[PDB]
Amino acid sequence: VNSFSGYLKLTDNVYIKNADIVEEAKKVKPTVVVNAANVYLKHGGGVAGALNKATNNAMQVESDDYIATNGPLKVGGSCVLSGHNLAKHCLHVVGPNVNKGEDIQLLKSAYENFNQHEVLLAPLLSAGIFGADPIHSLRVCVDTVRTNVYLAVFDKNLYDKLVSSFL
Numbered sequence: 001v002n003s004f005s006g007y008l009k010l011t012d013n014v015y016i017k018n019a020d021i022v023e024e025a026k027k028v029k030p031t032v033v034v035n036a037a038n039v040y041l042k043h044g045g046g047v048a049g050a051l052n053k054a055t056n057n058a059m060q061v062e063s064d065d066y067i068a069t070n071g072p073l074k075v076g077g078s079c080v081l082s083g084h085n086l087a088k089h090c091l092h093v094v095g096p097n098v099n100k101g102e103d104i105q106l107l108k109s110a111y112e113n114f115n116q117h118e119v120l121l122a123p124l125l126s127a128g129i130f131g132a133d134p135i136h137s138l139r140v141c142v143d144t145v146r147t148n149v150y151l152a153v154f155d156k157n158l159y160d161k162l163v164s165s166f167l
């Protein structure tokens with residue numbers, strides 16, 4: 001038993017809610033919150049800007065040190081950093097950004113990072129301003145992630161569309 005509330009059940013391991021991931025994290029304090037990061041860990045907008053703002057820019061400061069030491073991530077890759085005031089850890093996962101012309105096939109590789117963690121609070125990778133088809137991304141999530149994932153969808157109309165079309 002865990003502490004998430006009001007989530008709709010989709011498969012053996014995936015739950016979904018129309019919610020602000022920042023507020024879900026502040027409430028649950030999950031072991032792992034997933035950030036929809038880019039390879040430079042420049043947290044400007046979307047999930048990343050929202051999470052970083054909620055940490056008072058501490059996420060960005062930590063991320064800049066990470067990049068200075070290690071260089072950029074790969075599209076499809078991830079790193080584990082602090083969750084600051086939101087979670088124990090933040091798993092920064094880079095899905096492909098269709099608005100940058102990146103390869104949508106890399107979405108499955110991106111979701112595979114979730115399997116290294118027993119339970120996660122996460123956004124829908126590559127959706128929103130990342131420009132991929134969100135129905136396709138939810139499908140890839142359910143068909144790739146085997147650990148317990150609690151998906152937070154910000155946009156109400158999107159959430160309703162995703163639930164109503166889920167197979």
Ligand SMILES: O=C(O)C[C@H](NC(=O)c1ncnc2[nH]cnc12)c1ccccc1
Nearest residue numbers: 036046047050123126127128153154155
């Ligand atoms: O779920 C959605 O609608 C799409 C989702 N975007 C957000 O979650 C989001 N965006 C902006 N500001 C926010 N403040 C709280 N959540 C926020 C997203 C998924 C993947 C990559 C980029 C964005």
